[PDB]
Design a protein around this ligand. Structure first.
Ligand SMILES: [Zn+2]
Length: 258
């Protein structure tokens, strides 16, 4: 009876095994664009992904992760609300069974078709496992996906998904360039929050970009063909792997832009 996204193990159950689910700095949240405060003290984000080394793609039974080599400062995020250098370790997505839902973060209650998370950890803690125990240990870049035109830079990801259909499968995935997933503008909202899957630790500085990227109906259809289950256990399509919005409680969302 492991956690997941179904009727009987889904987000409304998670608190029984992970009491921090009802904590004071849980994610995701709804971003109220009229209540977000412009903070002109926020620096622009610095994304240096020109030396990124992707290694592998895998289906971990709740999403697919593309993993990067994080043994040196090769793909890093700096600037913005962050002190220090945060290394990219993996990215993944959350998506829906239909185009009108899928994202974790919402903007004035609007859901997008999917949400990309680029996960980075604070190099001062030395590894990822130590970073998740600290309040400033991780920085996640969140990017919304809407359905429209195809994103060429995602097609390489879509094409290998057939080879990792079921839980526990992996495949070599070298020379993928994550710069092909970024929108044009780097304006962002930021707030302190949590992992959105168990263990839901409150170690994340969230940076959510204002500008969505567009993907095609056909691209996102291919995400929906993946499986939560292992080979060949009964087929359960990996859809709606998103956590609903949580109470903002005592936090302020800040914007880098007016
Ligand atoms: Zn995520």
């Amino acid at each position: 009876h492991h956690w997941g996204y179904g009727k009987h193990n889904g987000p409304e159950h998670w608190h029984k095994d992970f009491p921090i689910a009802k904590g004071e700095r849980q994610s995701p949240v709804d971003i109220d664009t009229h209540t977000a405060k412009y903070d002109p003290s926020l620096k622009p984000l610095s994304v240096s992904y020109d030396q990124a080394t992707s290694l592998r793609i895998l289906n971990n039974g709740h999403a697919f992760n593309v993993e990067f080599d994080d043994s040196q400062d090769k793909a890093v995020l700096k600037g913005g609300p962050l002190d220090g250098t945060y290394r990219l370790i993996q990215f993944h997505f959350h998506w829906g069974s239909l185009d009108g839902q899928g994202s974790e973060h919402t903007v004035d209650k609007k859901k997008y078709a999917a949400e990309l998370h680029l996960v980075h950890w604070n190099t001062k803690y030395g590894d990822f496992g130590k970073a998740v125990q600290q309040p400033d240990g991780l920085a996640v870049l969140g990017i919304f996906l809407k359905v429209g035109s195809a994103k060429p830079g995602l097609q390489k990801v879509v094409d290998v998904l057939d080879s990792i259909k079921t839980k526990g499968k992996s495949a070599d995935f070298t020379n993928f360039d994550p710069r092909g997933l970024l929108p044009e503008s780097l304006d962002y909202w930021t707030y302190p929050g949590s992992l959105t899957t168990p263990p839901l630790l409150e170690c994340v500085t969230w940076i959510v970009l204002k500008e969505p990227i567009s993907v095609s109906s056909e691209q996102v259809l291919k995400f929906r063909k993946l499986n939560f289950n292992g080979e060949g256990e009964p087929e359960e399509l990996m859809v709606d792997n998103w956590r609903p919005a949580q109470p903002l409680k005592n936090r302020q969302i800040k914007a880098s832009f007016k």
